[PDB]
Amino acid sequence: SKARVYADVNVLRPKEYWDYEALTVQWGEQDDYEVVRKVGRGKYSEVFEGINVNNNEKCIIKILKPVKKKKIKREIKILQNLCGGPNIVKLLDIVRDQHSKTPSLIFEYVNNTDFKVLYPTLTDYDIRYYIYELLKALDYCHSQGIMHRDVKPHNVMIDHELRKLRLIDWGLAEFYHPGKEYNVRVASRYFKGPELLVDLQDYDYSLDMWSLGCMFAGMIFRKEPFFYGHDNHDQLVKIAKVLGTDGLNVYLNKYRIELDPQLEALVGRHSRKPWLKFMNADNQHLVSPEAIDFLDKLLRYDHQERLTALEAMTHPYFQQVRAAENS
Ligand SMILES: Nc1ncnc2c1ncn2[C@@H]1O[C@H](COP(=O)(O)OP(=O)(O)NP(=O)(O)O)[C@@H](O)[C@H]1O
Ligand SMILES: [Mg+2]
Ligand SMILES: [Mg+2]
């Protein structure tokens, strides 16, 4: 399997672009940024709203926990490669604690509204606008040869009042190389695509489109997360109960994949369930034909059949967003 678009970006660019184990950090001043209040975390870090002492503006401080040094160089190099791209979180400085050399990443501050509270207030149009904005970041990162690999609502900051979106958290991201087998232990469970769960390691930028589709399905069906499995195996079973197992078997045999037989038995045999069977009172003001048509072209087992970020932004579903953007 190879990417259908932007497959040669790293191929054609200099080794330094993508050779992040060779990064050379040019540390800033740890004192310029002060911690004001904890806003998030990961198994990987502590994230605080900070203040830039030199100009008084809010900032974000991402204090990294001890991990192999390559993991830190990777996240930094990707941020520097994308800095300036549409809706890509801006990395402002990199600083360390003299004593422990604990690295902290400094970012622009986005005044986010938690998605469990924001998403449910969104109008149909806003959903369209925000997914469109998130698509600009994904088309931009794919075009630069990088997969995000952790597309999910906690990694999408929205300042609703400013109608500003930033695709944050490039900590799992990677440079795309035609033919490389990648670890499949990436992304959040609800957003893991079929290829991660069936162990197809030579995946590409299309994994991010499956993750975007799960976010979209959650928004229009008012159901978070939309594929709610307790562990990986179960995550593939929740997928197979919606998409049907005929499609899966087509898919497994296309790429020459034999599932683990216990997994294979959990999965079982399920008829495809049309999308409209999730339509209800609460979500019917959001489930029209274009939404379904669009969602259907994102949530496909075959990563090769899924829309690319570029195709997705031109889908008719986003016509009004495009026109508003054009005048
Ligand atoms: N620029 C930002 N503006 C506002 N809030 C932010 C910003 N960056 C990060 N946060 C918050 O910090 C949380 C975690 O930081 P993030 O950069 O996603 O992750 P990580 O520590 O590498 N975690 P994870 O998603 O588990 O891998 C997010 O889910 C946000 O709520
Ligand atoms: Mg995160
Ligand atoms: Mg992360």
Torsion of CA 74, 78, 81, 84, to 10 degrees: -150
Same fold across 1-18+110-327 and 19-109: no
Ligand 1 site residues, Cβ closer than 6 angstroms: 39-40, 42, 44-45, 47, 60, 62, 89, 107-110, 112, 150, 154-155, 157, 168-169, 171
The answer to whether the CB of 52 falls within 8 A of the CB of 148 is: no
Q: Which of 62, 156, 169 to mutate to test the pocket of ligand 1 (most atoms within 8 A of CB)?
A: 169
150 labelled catalytic: yes
Handedness of CA 64, 68, 72, 74 (dihedral sign): negative
Phi, psi of 100, rounded to the nearest 5 degrees: -95, -10
Phi, psi of 199, rounded to the nearest 5 degrees: 65, 40
**DSSP character for 303?**
T
Solved how? X-ray
The answer to whether the CB of 295 falls within 8 A of the CB of 288 is: no
Catalytic residue from among 139, 150, 169, 204: 150
For residue 140, what are the contacts with CB-CB under 8 A and spacing of at least 6? 82, 85, 86, 87, 88
Phi, psi of 245, rounded to the nearest 5 degrees: -90, -15
Resolution for this experimental structure (Å): 2.2
Q: In the chain, where do the E strands start and end? A: 33-41, 45-52, 58-64, 91-96, 103-107, 146-147, 156-159, 164-167, 174-175
Q: How far is CA 54 from CA 25, 27, 57, 97, in A?
A: 22, 17, 8, 18
Residue positions counted in the chain: 327
- Domain locations in the chain? 1-18+110-327, 19-109
Domain 1-18+110-327 has CATH 3.30.230.10: no
Domain 19-109 has CATH 1.10.3720.10: no
Q: Tokens standing for 161?
A: 């009042």
Which residue CA neighbors atom 3 of ligand 1 most closely?
Answer: 110
